[PDB]
Amino acid sequence: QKVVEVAPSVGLSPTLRQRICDAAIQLMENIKYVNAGTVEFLVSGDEFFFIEVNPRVQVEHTITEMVTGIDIVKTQILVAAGADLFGEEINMPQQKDITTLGYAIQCRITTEDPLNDFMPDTGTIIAYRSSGGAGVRLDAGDGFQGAEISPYYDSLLVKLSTHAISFKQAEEKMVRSLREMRIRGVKTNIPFLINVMKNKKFTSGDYTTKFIEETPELFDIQPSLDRGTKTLEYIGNVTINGFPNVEKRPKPDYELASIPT
Amino acid sequence: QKVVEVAPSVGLSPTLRQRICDAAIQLMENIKYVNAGTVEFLVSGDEFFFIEVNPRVQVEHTITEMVTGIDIVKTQILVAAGADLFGEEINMPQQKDITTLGYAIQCRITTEDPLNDFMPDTGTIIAYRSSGGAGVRLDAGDGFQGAEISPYYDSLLVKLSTHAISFKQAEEKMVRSLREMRIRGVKTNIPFLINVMKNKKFTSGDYTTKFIEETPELFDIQPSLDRGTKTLEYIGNVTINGFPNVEKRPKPDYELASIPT
Amino acid sequence: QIKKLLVANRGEIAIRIFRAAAELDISTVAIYSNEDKSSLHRYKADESYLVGSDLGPAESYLNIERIIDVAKQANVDAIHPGYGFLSENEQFARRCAEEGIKFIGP
Numbered sequence: 137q138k139v140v141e142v143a144p145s146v147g148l149s150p151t152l153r154q155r156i157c158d159a160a161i162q163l164m165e166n167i168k169y170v171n172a173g174t175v176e177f178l179v180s181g182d183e184f185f186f187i188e189v190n191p192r193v194q195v196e197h198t199i200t201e202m203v204t205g206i207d208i209v210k211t212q213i214l215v216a217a218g219a220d221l222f223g224e225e226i227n228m229p230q231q232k233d234i235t236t237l238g239y240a241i242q243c244r245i246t247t248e249d250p251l252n253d254f255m256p257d258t259g260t261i262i263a264y265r266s267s268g269g270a271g272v273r274l275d276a277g278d279g280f281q282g283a284e285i286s287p288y289y290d291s292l293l294v295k296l297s298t299h300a301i302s303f304k305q306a307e308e309k310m311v312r313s314l315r316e317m318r319i320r321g322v323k324t325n326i327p328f329l330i331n332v333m334k335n336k337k338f339t340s341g342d343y344t345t346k347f348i349e350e351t352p353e354l355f356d357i358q359p360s361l362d363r364g365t366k367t368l369e370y371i372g373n374v375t376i377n378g379f380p381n382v383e384k385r386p387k388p389d390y391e392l393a394s395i396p397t
Numbered sequence: 398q399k400v401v402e403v404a405p406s407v408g409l410s411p412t413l414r415q416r417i418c419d420a421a422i423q424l425m426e427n428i429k430y431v432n433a434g435t436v437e438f439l440v441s442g443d444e445f446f447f448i449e450v451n452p453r454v455q456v457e458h459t460i461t462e463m464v465t466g467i468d469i470v471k472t473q474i475l476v477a478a479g480a481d482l483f484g485e486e487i488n489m490p491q492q493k494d495i496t497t498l499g500y501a502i503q504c505r506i507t508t509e510d511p512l513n514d515f516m517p518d519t520g521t522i523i524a525y526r527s528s529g530g531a532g533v534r535l536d537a538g539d540g541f542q543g544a545e546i547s548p549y550y551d552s553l554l555v556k557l558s559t560h561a562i563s564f565k566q567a568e569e570k571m572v573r574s575l576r577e578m579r580i581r582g583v584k585t586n587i588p589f590l591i592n593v594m595k596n597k598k599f600t601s602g603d604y605t606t607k608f609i610e611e612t613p614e615l616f617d618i619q620p621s622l623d624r625g626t627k628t629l630e631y632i633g634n635v636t637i638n639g640f641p642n643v644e645k646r647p648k649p650d651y652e653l654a655s656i657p658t
Numbered sequence: 659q660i661k662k663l664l665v666a667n668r669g670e671i672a673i674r675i676f677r678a679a680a681e682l683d684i685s686t687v688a689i690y691s692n693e694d695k696s697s698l699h700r701y702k703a704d705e706s707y708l709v710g711s712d713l714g715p716a717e718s719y720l721n722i723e724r725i726i727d728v729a730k731q732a733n734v735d736a737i738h739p740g741y742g743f744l745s746e747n748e749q750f751a752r753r754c755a756e757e758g759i760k761f762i763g764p
């Protein structure tokens with residue numbers, strides 16, 4: 137289960153990544169591929185292997201849009217209309233000029249309770265704030281200040297994605313939204329993505345596929361008391377049902393006491 | 398009024414902008430300049446002119462961040478500490494590693510009413526929805542939930558910037574995004590903004606600061622039949638003040654025998 | 659040459675495609691199951707149709723022929739399968755063709 141994606145790769149060498157992208161155009165050139173398509177590979181040192189091929193867009197296309205400035209999805213729709221990718225409708229820069237500018241990261245915020253082995257939680261969403269600002273991309277899914285997520289589907293509140301000149305800049309900046317996020321009503325997985333985001337083994341950029349299993353210090357102790365929620369709850373109780381002791385009338389008017397200091 | 402900002406310049410040839418930069422840099426390193434700074438030129442043919450310096454950030458710094466991938470306001474702060482530009486901290490590329498990948502546009506969403514002399518509107522916001530997705534950047538201003546905006550400050554609700562490899566593509570991105578926004582309870586400048594975006598003579602790139610003045614039809618603004626809003630006004634009205642000839646009873650649709658078809 | 663586009667999918671990616679489609683001045687049709695009654699994505703498209711009265715879980719997004727039903731009934735020139743349902747279904751791809759609906763993909 138893919139948890140977090142980076143564009144482009146890191147630490148992984150510049151020749152290596154060259155021969156892999158070469159190899160990608162090989163397979164697809166050879167069989168005359170058409171539309172968006174992910175060539176999968178597996179990297180063991182200066183050595184890779186083919187795995188499979190996803191013959192459609194991916195969840196993590198975001199990433200590749202942000203480091204090259206190509207709308208993949210809009211392009212799909214123009215390809216299927218007949219577009220030359222080097223005509224005036226797509227504006228594909230020829231392969232030689234296509235670049236990456238910096239590093240981007242995606243993580244999908246879901247309703248998986250990491251306190252309960254990532255069981256999708258459901259119900260109404262009754263408080264919702266996303267983020268925004270500098271090279272922060274947001275793709276809304278199921279989540280809005282209104283209504284509810286059902287057990288039937290891939291839980292995914294928000295695709296959240298960040299972008300900077302340096303990986304470590306993008307990691308900070310991804311952390312900083314994850315926290316601004318404010319979802320209430322359904323538990324979520326943010327707390328676990330934060331710890332992934334802020335792991336030393338992450339930035340160093342040399343992370344294996346077993347990154348996760350050999351790091352127990354990712355599933356970690358804090359349920360969060362509902363600080364101001366418990367407070368709205370007290371206030372709302374007293375207001376409707378009175379305070380047991382005290383002439384249950386409206387809130388009396390009070391002379392403002394300037395307070396010496 | 399700076400109304401719409403673009404980066405970089407569509408209308409300048411390579412060697413002009415290269416000289417337009419060089420000049421600015423000439424000024425700034427000649428007098429020791431430190432931190433963020435903007436040098437303004439007026440441009441007629443193949444000749445710049447120096448106009449002013451802005452010794453800080455400007456609203457439209459985001460547009461530069463989008464195409465250089467360098468966080469301007471971040472660095473400001475790093476610089477104030479004492480960090481170096483090309484050191485671990487700021488990770489600024491050397492002058493000839495810096496580039497534009499793509500083009501970005503900035504729009505500032507205000508409550509300035511176009512039909513009424515660009516005069517800031519006042520009051521509570523009764524509906525607020527924004528944007529997101531490919532190429533969209535949003536910097537929160539005054540708008541949310543149910544802010545009252547006051548007549549005391551520059552009304553700026555959202556800063557909206559978009560980003561793609563083609564300039565046209567950034568435009569048609571802007572217009573998507575503008576058309577998505579819902580701000581309710583105040584007038585805004587969205588339609589005027591839509592109306593500059595759509596304009597051939599802005600898409601052409603070749604535009605002068607005489608643009609808005611010699612394009613009168615920017616002000617041609619039809620309000621469309623916003624069904625949704627109107628229907629809520631009607632239901633609200635009847636719910637509270639009832640119907641003419643009709644007595645206030647418990648609301649029918651009271652046979653679950655639906656309708657033969 | 660695409661005037662009207664349908665998305666055989668739900669959630670972020672239907673939304674992603676709808677935004678993409680608008681950028682291109684193409685009308686959009688969405689589709690939803692029952693329990694997707696109040697999904698964001700259903701509200702983000704120019705047009706929206708229930709996929710059949712009777713279908714439950716995911717079965718509602720995997721029904722090749724009924725999605726085509728909606729597709730034909732609404733004058734659609736192309737379908738974007740998105741990812742995760744019929745995105746990778748030969749049947750769907752093939753049947754789209756036979757009916758003059760452009761399958762977006764390979």
Ligand SMILES: O=CCCCC[C@@H]1SC[C@@H]2NC(=O)N[C@@H]21
Nearest residue numbers: 370372373374375377378379380
């Ligand atoms: O009457 C119901 C509203 C909730 C009352 C709770 C407050 S806390 C202080 C005071 N002492 C109590 O045992 N109950 C009220």
Ligand SMILES: O=CCCCC[C@@H]1SC[C@@H]2NC(=O)N[C@@H]21
Nearest residue numbers: 631634635636637638639640641
């Ligand atoms: O004052 C009563 C509430 C207003 C209801 C307005 C509706 S619109 C159709 C019909 N024509 C009227 O003059 N009033 C009702």
